[PDB]
Design a protein around this nucleic acid. Structure first.
Length: 88
DNA sequence: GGTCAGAAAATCGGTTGTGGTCAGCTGCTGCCACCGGTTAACCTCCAATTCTGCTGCCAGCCT
């Protein structure tokens, strides 16, 4: 929203701004790769009726991505209790 | 002890007249079918035989 209409060159400030932008996505990817086992453990109980196993796991992956989008830390709860709703 | 206007038939066709009649939407109004988002104690790794060709493998003369 700033570079849409305004141009500035602080070199160190722009470098650390891009550093924040990169490492936020690094953090998000690390969180998803941490909770993949939760996704698999939830999806292992729906097998045998209708769909395959890995389709269920990838749908749980989409639900986990949405839960990471919707997560809030100010209420102060364990992440798995919030993410189980979106995965299911 | 014969010719000419009128009357009386269907006949082909235009008027017409209204009497419904059916649909063609047209709101419209309620409703109902369908799609999307959301839920905050915790609990984080699966259910037989026959034949031909190919590749992987190990000793072993040769340099």
């Amino acid at each position: 929203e700033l570079s849409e209409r305004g141009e500035k060159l602080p070199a160190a400030q722009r470098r650390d701004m891009m550093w924040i932008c990169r490492d936020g996505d690094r953090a998000k990817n690390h969180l998803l790769e941490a909770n993949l086992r939760l996704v698999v453990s939830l999806a292992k109980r729906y097998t045998g009726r209708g769909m395959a196993f890995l389709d269920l796991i990838q749908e749980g992956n989409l639900g986990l991505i949405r839960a990471v989008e919707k997560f809030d830390y100010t209420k102060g709860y364990k992440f798995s209790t919030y993410a189980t709703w979106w995965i299911r």
